Amino acid sequence: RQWALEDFEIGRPLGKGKFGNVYLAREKQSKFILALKVLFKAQLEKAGVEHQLRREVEIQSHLRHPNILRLYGYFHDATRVYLILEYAPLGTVYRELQKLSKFDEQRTATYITELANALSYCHSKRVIHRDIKPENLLLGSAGELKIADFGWSTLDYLPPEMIEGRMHDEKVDLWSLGVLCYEFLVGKPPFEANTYQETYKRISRVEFTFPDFVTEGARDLISRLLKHNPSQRPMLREVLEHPWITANSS
Amino acid sequence: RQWALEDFEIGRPLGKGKFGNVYLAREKQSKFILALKVLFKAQLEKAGVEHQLRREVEIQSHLRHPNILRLYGYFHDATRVYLILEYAPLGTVYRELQKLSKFDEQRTATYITELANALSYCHSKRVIHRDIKPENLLLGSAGELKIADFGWSTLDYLPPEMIEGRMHDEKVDLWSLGVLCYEFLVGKPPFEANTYQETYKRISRVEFTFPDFVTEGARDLISRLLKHNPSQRPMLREVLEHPWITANSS
Ligand SMILES: O=C(Nc1ccc(Nc2nc(Nc3ccc(O)cc3)ncc2F)cc1)c1ccccc1Cl
Ligand SMILES: O=C(Nc1ccc(Nc2nc(Nc3ccc(O)cc3)ncc2F)cc1)c1ccccc1Cl
Question: Cα separation of A167 and A162, whole Å?
């Protein structure tokens, strides 16, 4: 059963992205609440990322996990593309982190567990993510983490393989986890800088430090994840078993 | 200065491809004879290769070499894409090879030289080719070889890196040269078979033999090119210097 814009009542804007906004919406016939992401073809085409989107939509449609935002379907009209998405009521992790400044060890451990599980499910279907940013980590009604950026296959979140033009792997997800884990605990990502040129150098040299309040256990996990060599990074299985994770996660 | 279909008089079909035909055409205002390749958007989009084409057109527009078919420009209407191409009057090498059965050493050496030069120019601009088939090797008015398949970055022409799902390189062009050189001399490519499954195995094992009429010099060149390890293949510079090439090429 195909869709069109007239099938939905559009509510307030949830976010204004670069390629278009995502709105709250309600399917008229069923009253099913959801999110509607509205993209403009001409913009996608001029940026040269329309095919990159079609692939990402193809992958997402296959993925069912409580910590991955569902793609229900999609459609288009003369000038726009529309993605019909699950609605995450509690907003972005980014906003949560701004309000709180930083997260305690149990909230962080819990989120990393949820991410590791989601990525573990993705890994078993041979799917990776370019980038996992807090702006695309959403919260379900019970506060459950939901990955909103779509799967593949500002530099802050990119691993050295990618930025240096090296050969990337399933292991980019492990770096992502280390970046997020740090950002959750200290309130900004470990390679933050005022320029791209400097953020690049820092990612490439793996040059970061920990504030004094970051405990030994978290240091150990974060350091194991943020290895320059992707092969030196652990498997997702091992992150879920790290004593700092098991001691603190739900 | 943009184009449209009304700018051209369309002549007979030069070839009927999968995604559309290429026609002889004459620009009305200038009387400039050329080839017009006509593609259907909906077909490209359904096959999922529209972006692959846009990239290939972007690369080709940059390439100027007497042995690379010129792309003059392009345009589109509601349903079609149009590529404005240089006209190669003497047709495909494939047809030439069918008429002749096989080529002598001097015609072959000459063609490989022309290909090596074209690829050498492409290599210096960091461009490769997925596949170089005789069906996409065209002939200019003086019989000069022109590469018609566009640049990147039936299995007969694909190297083992690609078919095995390995990491490919600039070195795929060297394999291509070895396949063509053989096909030119014997009149069919070295891994030909009645099935894809068998052609695959043969490419992967590098399993071919030479008819008795293929001379030592040609055996030596072809064998150096068709190495399983891409790193073991020579540089284009060395192909142009091979004694069998220099002894026989124009
Ligand atoms: O990425 C951002 N926002 C954002 C917003 C919506 C989406 N997509 C969806 N979001 C929502 N829920 C949501 C609820 C309340 C909010 O305030 C925000 C979101 N559900 C489904 C989505 F696809 C993705 C991302 C963002 C980026 C920079 C700064 C602040 C923010 Cl909130
Ligand atoms: O690929 C084939 N043909 C083909 C035809 C045209 C193009 N494109 C252009 N060709 C031509 N010239 C040409 C002249 C006479 C001919 O009989 C054929 C071509 N110039 C420009 C092209 F873009 C590319 C390829 C082919 C494929 C299988 C069997 C036989 C053939 Cl002739």
Answer: 7
